[PDB]
UniProtKB/TrEMBL annotation, chain A:
Protein name per Swiss-Prot or TrEMBL: DUF2891 domain-containing protein
From TrEMBL, chain B:
Superkingdom in the source lineage: Bacteria
Annotated InterPro entries: DUF2891
Protein name: DUF2891 domain-containing protein
Pfam families membership: DUF2891
Length: 336, 334
């Protein structure tokens, strides 16, 4: 019921996003001078919502709403919109961009993880709805591509990427692990788990020099959330106690202080609204592995962070083209 | 003579870079569907060298070589190349892109700092050579733009950016500080110093979770180098002792282990060659503020890092379009 206002708002934002062409930002590599075209031509599906990765998870937001909150949503409009987007022809256009060797490394790893999350959501919806089964088949090729790219790249990673931006390794791998397990892709699952262990198992008593001025993710929290899915419960509970040993004393203080957002009209600083949302998302996930006191403390901390940001997700397009997805992630965490 | 092979190599690479159109990578925002053009049209000067910021510091590399290593370099060819590049018409084209409100935030802050480093270098060369004074005049408007952008943005930064990629705050501000001081821009100098103090002065006993897979800069070392120019010597020496208090025991071990580069054909992993080069650069600078033992230790460590990377700067364009600048930076530290 509190979700009703949210679902309506998230529906409006995401439906506007996926078709809104301008303004836009491309991060595009090429070895042919003719390979410089409008996003609508380069990305037949994901040309809107300011950039490719934001468009992908704007689509995820609509699929998640359709699966679990359809009674609060303009379901028929959403279905019409996703039908015209997820055609075979448009999906082949995206895959043709992805498979071009001149575009190697495109959207790694944020777009990769988010697309696997979108594919996961469509496949879960397809158990419940016949229209989603066509979408899942039409987007299968792109998801297989990213699965292959993860398998090729992860063995090359001697080091992780820790920064709380879209390059964050833990965020992408968290979604990729959920997808791997749903598909029963044992090789992808093992690759993620071993990579996570290699990078992170010796981490303890984290300093947490965060936030940095352009982050929408917490390095220490996103890492912990990935390890909460990689490790077994009791090992993670043990690891987490050594990871951030003074949480019950609200230390480090930065994790219990919602971040300041000095200028929402600057694209980089506007990420800090997302950080307050994603902190709440991560704090809620981690709360399920804590003792009674720390569990309530982290959930109260999450609410404080969520409340600092939720009212600003529609202040301008630099925020509205993506914040709704993280607001839903934070709201959707099953608390136990 | 030890510099001769290096300078020739850096000259060949940079001269190739500034004119080489393809391959290329644009990070481009727009609010008009027609504002999507080839780099040669969007960036009349800095269209080559894979991307805008790498082209800028490839130009710096050529100006630095012309100023201080001209007897080892193809001096006349470099002068001819920079003459056709640094025209008023082409410079106005770059500024027109920069001033377009649809391009707000472009190249912040890596391109900003490198362009000020390039302008500084040209202004120093202009004291020795008359053609460089025309270049300095032609690029002055762009330099004033980035100075103004720094002054507008720095007060909005409640937090720094620490990551060892081109978003690193300390790297850009280090060069911007050198420019501010040469130009005697007291306001820009004050802005940089106040921000650095605000973000970093309470940092101590750093954990140094480095490297990360795509970094060409060390977060802990680049911050320290910035503070070495922001703080007074004796304050910095005290600050540095608390910042990384176990350096004389070679701790944290990561800083005394040159990083591994698993795949030089991947654009992100290839940054790790630059990390070994930039670590050497930072270690050499910081060694001037240490006691005898730590000073020698950091210089030996610097040499080891440099030697691990120097042979790979021409392995492929993913490296050669930028690595030469960091190799010269490391070689150039007095």
């Amino acid at each position: 019921d509190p979700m009703e206002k949210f679902i309506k708002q998230f529906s409006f934002i995401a439906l506007e996003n996926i078709f809104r062409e301008l303004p836009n930002k491309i991060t595009h590599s090429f070895n042919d001078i003719n390979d410089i075209k409008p996003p609508k031509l380069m990305y037949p599906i994901f040309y809107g919502s300011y950039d490719w990765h934001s468009s992908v998870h704007s689509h995820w937001l609509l699929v998640k709403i359709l699966k679990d909150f359809s009674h609060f949503a303009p379901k028929d409009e959403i279905i019409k919109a996703l039908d015209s987007q997820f055609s075979k022809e448009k999906a082949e256009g995206e895959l043709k961009y992805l498979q071009n060797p001149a575009h190697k490394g495109f959207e790694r790893p944020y777009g990769w993880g988010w697309f696997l999350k979108l594919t996961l959501e469509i496949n879960l919806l397809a158990k419940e709805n016949d229209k989603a089964e066509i979408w899942a088949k039409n987007l299968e090729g792109i998801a297989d591509f990213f699965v292959k790219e993860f398998k090729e790249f992860l063995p090359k990673m001697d080091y992780p990427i820790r920064v709380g931006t879209h390059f964050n390794s833990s965020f992408a791998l968290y979604f990729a692990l959920e997808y791997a397990r749903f598909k029963k892709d044992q090789e992808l699952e093992y690759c993620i788990i071993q990579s996570a262990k290699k990078w992170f198992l010796s981490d303890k008593n984290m300093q947490a020099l965060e936030p940095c001025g352009d982050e929408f993710l917490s390095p220490v929290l996103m890492e912990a959330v990935l390890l909460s899915a990689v490790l077994h419960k009791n090992d993670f509970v043990k690891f987490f106690k050594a990871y951030l040993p003074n949480l019950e004393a609200k230390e480090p203080a930065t994790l219990f202080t919602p971040v300041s957002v000095s200028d929402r009209s600057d694209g980089k600083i506007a990420h800090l609204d997302g950080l307050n949302l994603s902190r709440a998302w991560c704090f809620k996930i981690l709360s399920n592995f804590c003792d009674e006191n720390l569990k309530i403390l982290l959930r109260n901390n999450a609410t404080e962070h969520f409340d600092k940001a939720i009212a600003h997700i529609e202040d301008d397009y630099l925020g509205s083209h993506w914040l709704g997805s993280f607001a839903l992630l934070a709201l959707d965490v099953d608390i136990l």
